[PDB]
Amino acid sequence: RRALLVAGKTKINLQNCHFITGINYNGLTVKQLQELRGILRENSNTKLLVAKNTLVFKALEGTKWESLKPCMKGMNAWIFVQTEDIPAALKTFVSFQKEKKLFDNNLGGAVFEKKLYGPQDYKVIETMPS
Amino acid sequence: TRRAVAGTIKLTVLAGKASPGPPVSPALGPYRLNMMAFCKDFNARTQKYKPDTPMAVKITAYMDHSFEFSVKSPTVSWYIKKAAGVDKGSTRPGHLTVTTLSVRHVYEIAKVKQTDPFCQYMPLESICKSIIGTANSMGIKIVQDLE
Amino acid sequence: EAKFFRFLKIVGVGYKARAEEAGRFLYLKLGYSHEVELAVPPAVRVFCFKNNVVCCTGIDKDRVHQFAATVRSCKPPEVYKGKGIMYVDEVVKKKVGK
Amino acid sequence: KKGDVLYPKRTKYSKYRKGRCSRGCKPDGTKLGFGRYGIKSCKAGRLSYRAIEAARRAIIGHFHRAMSGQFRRNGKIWVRVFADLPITGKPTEVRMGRGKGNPTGWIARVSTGQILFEMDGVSLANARQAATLAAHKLCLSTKFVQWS
Amino acid sequence: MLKFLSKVKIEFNTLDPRLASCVEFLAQCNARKAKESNPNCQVLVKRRTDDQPPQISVTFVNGVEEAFDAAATSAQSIRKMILDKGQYLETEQMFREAGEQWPVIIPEEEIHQEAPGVKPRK
Amino acid sequence: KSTTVVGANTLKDRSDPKILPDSDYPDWLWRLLQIRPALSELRRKNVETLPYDDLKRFVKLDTRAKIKENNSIKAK
Amino acid sequence: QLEYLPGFPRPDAKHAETILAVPRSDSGKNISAKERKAGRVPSIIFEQEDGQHGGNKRLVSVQTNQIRKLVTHLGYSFFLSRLFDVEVRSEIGSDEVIEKVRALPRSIHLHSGTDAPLNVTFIRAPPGTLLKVDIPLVFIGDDVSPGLKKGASLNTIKRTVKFLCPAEIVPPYIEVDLSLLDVGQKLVAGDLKVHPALKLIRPKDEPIVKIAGGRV
Ligand SMILES: [Mg+2]
Numbered sequence: 001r002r003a004l005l006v007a008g009k010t011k012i013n014l015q016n017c018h019f020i021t022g023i024n025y026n027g028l029t030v031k032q033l034q035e036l037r038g039i040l041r042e043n044s045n046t047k048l049l050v051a052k053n054t055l056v057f058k059a060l061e062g063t064k065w066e067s068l069k070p071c072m073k074g075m076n077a078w079i080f081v082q083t084e085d086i087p088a089a090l091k092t093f094v095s096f097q098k099e100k101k102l103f104d105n106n107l108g109g110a111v112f113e114k115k116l117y118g119p120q121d122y123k124v125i126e127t128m129p130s
Numbered sequence: 131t132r133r134a135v136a137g138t139i140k141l142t143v144l145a146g147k148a149s150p151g152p153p154v155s156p157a158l159g160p161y162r163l164n165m166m167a168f169c170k171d172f173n174a175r176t177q178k179y180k181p182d183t184p185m186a187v188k189i190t191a192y193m194d195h196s197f198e199f200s201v202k203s204p205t206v207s208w209y210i211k212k213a214a215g216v217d218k219g220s221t222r223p224g225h226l227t228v229t230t231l232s233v234r235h236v237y238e239i240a241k242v243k244q245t246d247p248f249c250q251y252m253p254l255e256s257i258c259k260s261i262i263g264t265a266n267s268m269g270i271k272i273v274q275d276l277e
Numbered sequence: 278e279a280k281f282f283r284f285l286k287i288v289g290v291g292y293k294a295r296a297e298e299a300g301r302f303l304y305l306k307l308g309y310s311h312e313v314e315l316a317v318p319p320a321v322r323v324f325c326f327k328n329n330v331v332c333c334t335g336i337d338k339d340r341v342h343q344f345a346a347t348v349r350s351c352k353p354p355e356v357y358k359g360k361g362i363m364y365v366d367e368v369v370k371k372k373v374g375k
Numbered sequence: 376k377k378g379d380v381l382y383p384k385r386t387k388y389s390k391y392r393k394g395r396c397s398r399g400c401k402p403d404g405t406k407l408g409f410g411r412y413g414i415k416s417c418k419a420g421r422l423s424y425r426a427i428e429a430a431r432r433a434i435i436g437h438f439h440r441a442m443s444g445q446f447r448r449n450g451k452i453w454v455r456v457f458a459d460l461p462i463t464g465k466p467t468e469v470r471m472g473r474g475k476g477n478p479t480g481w482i483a484r485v486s487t488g489q490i491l492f493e494m495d496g497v498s499l500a501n502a503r504q505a506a507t508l509a510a511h512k513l514c515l516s517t518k519f520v521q522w523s
Numbered sequence: 524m525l526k527f528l529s530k531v532k533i534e535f536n537t538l539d540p541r542l543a544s545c546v547e548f549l550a551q552c553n554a555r556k557a558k559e560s561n562p563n564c565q566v567l568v569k570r571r572t573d574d575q576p577p578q579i580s581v582t583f584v585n586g587v588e589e590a591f592d593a594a595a596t597s598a599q600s601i602r603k604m605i606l607d608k609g610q611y612l613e614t615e616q617m618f619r620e621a622g623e624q625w626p627v628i629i630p631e632e633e634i635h636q637e638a639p640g641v642k643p644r645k
Numbered sequence: 646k647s648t649t650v651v652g653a654n655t656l657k658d659r660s661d662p663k664i665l666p667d668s669d670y671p672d673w674l675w676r677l678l679q680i681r682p683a684l685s686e687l688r689r690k691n692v693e694t695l696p697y698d699d700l701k702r703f704v705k706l707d708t709r710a711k712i713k714e715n716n717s718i719k720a721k
Numbered sequence: 722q723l724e725y726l727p728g729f730p731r732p733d734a735k736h737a738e739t740i741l742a743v744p745r746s747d748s749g750k751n752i753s754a755k756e757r758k759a760g761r762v763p764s765i766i767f768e769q770e771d772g773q774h775g776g777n778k779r780l781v782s783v784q785t786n787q788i789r790k791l792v793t794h795l796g797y798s799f800f801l802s803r804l805f806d807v808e809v810r811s812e813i814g815s816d817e818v819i820e821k822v823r824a825l826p827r828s829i830h831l832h833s834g835t836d837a838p839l840n841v842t843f844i845r846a847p848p849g850t851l852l853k854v855d856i857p858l859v860f861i862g863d864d865v866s867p868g869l870k871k872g873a874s875l876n877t878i879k880r881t882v883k884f885l886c887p888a889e890i891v892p893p894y895i896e897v898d899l900s901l902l903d904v905g906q907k908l909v910a911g912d913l914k915v916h917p918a919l920k921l922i923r924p925k926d927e928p929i930v931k932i933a934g935g936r937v
Contacts, residue, residue, distance in 0.1 A: 001704060004692060008700070026550055031248055038251030070538050074546035104553060108537055116538055118572055134559065145655075180655045204655070212652040233674050234664055235650055242653070255673060262677060274675060276647070279627050282614055314644045319633035326621050332614075336629050340638065347641045401833035406797075411877075417834045445872030445935050488833025496874055500718060522880070523796035683864055 006051045010059050013047055016082035019089075020065060021110040025050070025077045028105055033077075040092055045083035050076070067116060071109030090126035133192050137161060140188040142205070146181035148172045161191045168197050175201065184208055200247045206264050209239045220269030230271040236261050279322075281338045283345040284365045287329040288354070292361075296325050303331070307352050307362075315351075318344060330365070379428050382481040383459050390475050391460055394484075396421055401488035407522050409453045410493030412502035414509060417516045419487045423480060424458035430492065430509040437505045438497060450501075453493040458483040485515060524602060525557040525564055527609035529584055532567040533593075535577030541594050545577045548598035581605065585612060684710060723848065723889045726916060732803055732893050736795055739806040740788075742766075742781035743813060756782050757839070764841040766807065766824060769850065779820070781809055788838050792829065798857040798881055801826055803893055807843055823847055825854075825888070846888040853922065854886040856893075860930070862900040868932040873904045876931045882910060885920040892916070897930070907931035 025033065037048040053072045060066060081089050093107065110122050117125070139161065143153055150158075150165035158165055168189065176185060186202035203209075211217045214229040240257035243249065249257070265272055287294055293306040300322035305313040317323045321335035321344050331348065335341040354361040354369045363369060377384070399419050407413050431454055438450040458481040465476040485491070492509065494502050503519055510517040531552060535545045551557070552566060579593040579601060589608065591601050615625050647664075654661045687695075687703045695703065725731055745756065745763060753763050761782040768777050792800050807824045811817040822845055830840035846852060858880055863869055882895065895913055902908070911925030 001692065001707075005700070005704060008697065012697070024546075026553060027555070034248070034251065041251065070540040073540070073543040075550060119537060119570070120572075178657060180657045183655050209653065213650045233677065234670075235653070236677075237670070237674050238650070238653065238662060258674075258677065272678065274678060278631075279629055311645050315641055318638040318641060319636045320629065320638075322627065322629060324618070324621075324623060326617065332618075334627060334629075336631065337634055344641060347643075351643050403833075404831045405833045415833075446874075448936050449874045451874075495877070523798060685861060685864055 003055060006049075006055050007059050009049055009051070010056065010080075013049065013080040013082070014063070014065075017080050018084055019081055019086065019110055019112045020068065021079045021081075021107055022071065022076040023079060023093075024075050024105050024108055026075050026104055028102070032100065032102075036096060039096060040079065044081070044085075044089055044092055046079055046081040046089060049078050049080065051078055064114065065111055067114055068109070068111050071116060085130065087126050087129050090122070133194060133196065135190060136193055137191045138188060139191060140186065142184045142186055143172070144181065145176045145179050145183040145185050146173070148176075158189075162195070163189070163191055164195055164197075168199075171197065171199075203243060203246060206239065206243065206261055207268065209242070210236070210261065210265055210270070211268075213239070214270060223267060223269035226269050227271050228269050230273060230276055231265070232273050232276045236265065236272070279334045279336055281335055281341045283333045283341055285331040285333070285345060285348060285362055286365050287331065287362050289360045292329070294325050294329065294331050296323055300324055300334075303348065305348075305351065313351055315348065331362075379432075381424050381427065381454070381458055382461075386459075386461070389461070389478065390463055394460075396484045399484075399486040401486060405488045405490055405520075407490065407493060407520065408455070410451070410495040411522045412494045412497075412499070412506070413490050413520045414492040414494075414506045414517050415488060415490045415520045416485050417487065417518050420485055420515050421482045422456065422458070422485055422491075422513060422515065423482050425480075426513055427454065427456060427458060427483065427491075429512040433508045433512060434492065434494070434505045437508055438501065441501050442497065450497040451495045453495075454491075455493060456483050456485060456489065456491045460484065490520070491517065524606075525552065525560045527583060527612070528561070528564050528581055528605070530565045530567065530582045532569070532580045533578075534569045534571070534575065534580070535593070536572070536574065537570055538572070539574070539577070542577055544596065544598045544601075545579065545593045548579060548593070548601055551598055551602055583609065583612060585616065587612065722918070723887065725890055729916070730893055730896065736791070736803075737806075738787070738791065739808050740783055741813070742783045742807065742809045744809065744811070744819070745780040745782045748780065753839075757785075760785050762788050762838045762841055764843060766809070766820075766822070766843040766845065768845040779809070783841055785838060788829075788841060792831075792838065796857075797829075797831075798855070799893065800829065802854050802856045802891060804846060804888065804891065805843075823888075825852060825891075848887075848889050850888050852886050852888060852891070853883060854891050855881045855883045856886075856891075856895055857881050858897055858929070859894045860897050860899060862898045865900040866902050866932070868902055868904040868906075869899070871904060872935045873932050874935060876933055878907075878931065879910075879927070879929050882913065882929075883922045884915070885922055887918060890916050890918065892919075899930075902932050904932055904934050 028036070033048075040046045040048060053076055056078060057069070057072060060068065083089065090107075097103070097105075107119055107122070109119070110117055112122070112125075139157070141153060141157060148154070148169045150169045154165055154169065158168075172187065179185070184204045186204060187199060188202060189197060189199045192198075208217075210231070211219075211229075213235050214231050216228065218228065220226040220228055236258055237254075240254050240261055243257050243261070244252070244254070262272065289308070291306070292308060295304045296302065297304055301317050303315045303317055303323045305315070307313060318340055320337040321333060321340050324332040324334060326332065333341055333345045333348070335344075349362050349364070352361040354363045356370075356372055357374045359369045359371060397419060405415060431452065434452055435450075439447065442450065460482050461478040462480055462482055463476040464479040491513075492506075494505065497505075499521075506517070506519045533545055533549060535542045549568070558564075577593045579591045580588065581591070582588045587608075589605070591604070593601070618625050618627070649663050650661055652661065681702065682699075684703075684706050687699065687706070692700060692703070742764065743761075745752070756763050762785050764781045764783050766779045766781060767775070771777065795803070804823055804825055807820075807822050808818060809820045809822075811819060824843040825846045827842040827844045828840075829838060829842070831837070832839055844852070860875075860877070863875070869875065886892075892915065895915065897908065897913070908929045908931075909925060910921060910923055910927045910929055912929075913921075915921075
């Protein structure tokens with residue numbers, strides 16, 4: 001039943017998605033998780049979901065997001081973005097990190113156009129606008 | 131932060147009357163907390179509000195006597211009883227009825243409750259149905275339109 | 278060369294321990310008029326430290342644990358103030374005395 | 376009925392023969408007649424009216440404490456076994472034959488598969504535990520039966 | 524769990540699929556119940572794109588360095604073996620502070636010798 | 646009385662608000678007391694054809710029911 | 722028109738097993754005890770057309786584990802208001818199938834003390850045959866009832882209803898809705914929502930369930 005819950009929760013979120021990331025939520029509380037979800041839900045066009053890694057593993061099979069497979073271990077909060085503006089999508093985490101002083105929770109892994117950029121590699125792509 | 135959180139204790143104080151003895155006596159003295167600086171910080175912000183209003187203050191006590199508090203709006207029981215009528219709850223709620231409110235008071239109370247410092251992102255349907263659930267819990271009736 | 282180790286802590290007003298001969302003889306003072314002498318068996322030696330702590334050190338796990346329980350059984354902890362010999366990691370739960 | 380302790384108000388004859396009770400079964404199977412749960416017997420024997428009253432009191436007192444308020448009497452009990460055989464008895468320090476003794480009490484003949492109690496209007500767990508409590512007052516071996 | 528360590532160095536590759544044990548040890552060592560137990564203890568996270576395998580290299584208070592196979596052993600097995608070495612180090616230090624020689628040597632022939640039961644005596 | 650709320654707004658410069666007619670208010674206010682269905686109907690239906698809010702209510706009432714049925718049985 | 726209408730329950734496909742039997746050569750307590758010791762339940766398959774002269778009967782024996790599993794999983798009354806496939810072969814593991822037929826369990830005998838099955842009865846019900854079937858009731862909507870909300874208690878007068886049913890559309894159970902009953906009222910046997918081709922054997926002015934007021 002929860003398998004169908006998160007299958008629907010990813011089937012709705014993959015309808016307009018163009019890149020996918022996963023954040024290590026070690027040490028984040030419920031209120032700060034809600035604040036991250038709020039910042040990235042009003043100020044952008046993104047959505048946050050914490051899900052079973054094997055269930056996202058099985059629910060992304062047969063899709064162009066099949067390259068992700070190494071980057072699904074440990075504590076994963078999956079962020080699905082239904083929009084295209086990656087500078088405003090990725091600078092919000094910079095503002096969040098520099099404001100609330102959270103170095104223990106970083107961006108590990110992302111998928112854009114059949115490629116897994118390094119966390120160093122999807123740093124310059126937020127500089128280029130549109 | 132890095133400090134070992136001891137307790138989180140809440141209280142209700144009327145607006146403007148932060149005299150640290152009738153409600154700020156043993157309630158804050160049970161946890162070794164100070165009574166001067168917290169009252170100064172409390173009276174340094176409720177200058178723009180109507181007095182004799184039961185403002186909700188949650189204070190996170192610490193072992194180094196540091197105050198890190200946020201100010202909450204007055205209680206939804208107060209908001210749903212004072213905007214309705216008599217402040218007396220039923221002997222048997224859900225079956226015995228006191229007052230009646232249709233659709234509008236709960237909706238604007240939800241709009242005011244959205245101003246809670248960690249309710250920036252909860253939807254108005256969520257807040258309205260939460261207040262409906264509170265309204266079920268003291269025995270007041272809700273209808274589509276009182277006439 | 279020793280491998281198996283066990284530690285004991287003594288709690289009490291005037292309760293004392295002392296090793297006598299090369300770590301082979303153990304002597305104890307538990308509030309009686311006399312003292313308590315125990316002969317540490319082979320494959321085990323005993324040592325005493327400056328926190329009222331007795332160490333049972335040895336090479337045979339059976340003899341080490343049996344002798345540590347033997348030293349403990351001379352005086353178990355009481356439930357009203359915790360006085361006696363106990364294990365270091367052991368928690369003693371007290372109760373109030375009417 | 377007679378309130379708690381159940382025996383007939385009057386009978387045709389004062390003294391009855393002893394009879395036999397160690398045999399007898401329900402030759403067609405048994406089903407519940409009024410309730411959803413019930414207690415039936417697995418063996419055949421005798422039960423006294425004091426034991427039946429003690430079992431009924433145990434069930435109603437368990438429902439009394441488990442469920443209160445308006446559901447306190449939502450549990451319904453049917454007692455389907457009735458004690459209508461008087462038993463007699465001679466006192467101490469008496470010889471063998473000068474007639475038949477005075478009656479002392481009443482018993483009920485219970486067969487194999489006879490339903491003693493029936494319960495409705497409660498939870499399944501409350502019914503099972505009330506049957507467990509009631510079977511400790513009866514000398515016979517009982518089973519919990521459920522409607523299906 | 525964090526009483527006996529001085530510096531920990533975690534190193535791994537982020538796009539290589541064997542990082543589960545090392546990030547689980549990161550979760551074990553960066554808890555709220557951990558860092559309050561040793562405020563002076565240091566953590567060192569390093570990430571690299573190249574193919575150096577994921578390793579946990581720790582040091583203790585008494586200058587002993589230990590490298591562990593973080594690729595094939597789990598974080599909980601690492602947590603058990605660090606304490607297994609740590610309590611031995613503590614026992615060594617506790618013996619050494621009191622004036623006893625370390626390591627203490629017992630003749631390995633008394634295992635064959637018979638021993639009677641220990642009855643306490645006056 | 647029935648045309649103004651009392652004691653709602655607490656800003657000293659302003660006043661308590663009024664009761665607007667059904668012209669400024671959006672649609673979802675009058676949907677508040679519809680019969681959101683209970684576990685007697687949602688259990689027997691097909692989960693695969695259920696909409697999002699209904700299946701969310703299904704799993705939430707299922708979790709509440711299993712918590713209550715644990716707490717009522719295991720209690721002594 | 723011999724099909725279940727929409728809005729009606731249907732027999733489940735989980736409990737749609739086939740019942741396997743082997744022939745039995747005699748009647749009586751001797752061979753009955755021998756079959757029960759060997760681990761089989763005695764049975765007979767018969768038809769309706771000739772009540773005298775037997776009725777084209779065949780004496781068989783079915784498997785105790787299968788029959789006990791069916792009765793435990795379905796319930797006693799639900800097993801008796803549902804059709805089954807019966808396959809009679811000459812031996813267990815043999816392929817010489819003697820008779821495959823669609824039959825109704827007319828009765829099952831359970832021991833009054835141990836509840837082991839002692840006898841199963843099967844009656845041949847091909848399409849076009851009329852039966853007297855006892856259908857169980859299922860009571861729904863007890864959370865919506867205003868009378869039950871007000872603290873009244875439920876008085877279930879009857880649990881099963883006897884009907885005259887053609888074989889094809891025999892209902893497994895009858896759903897009775899209690900959403901709109903307050904304190905004081907009862908439902909009679911004429912309020913049951915059934916197929917129009919089913920005839921009620923009992924008179925329609927027979928109470929089924931009444932909601933009676935609580936002890937104020
Ligand atoms: Mg015969």
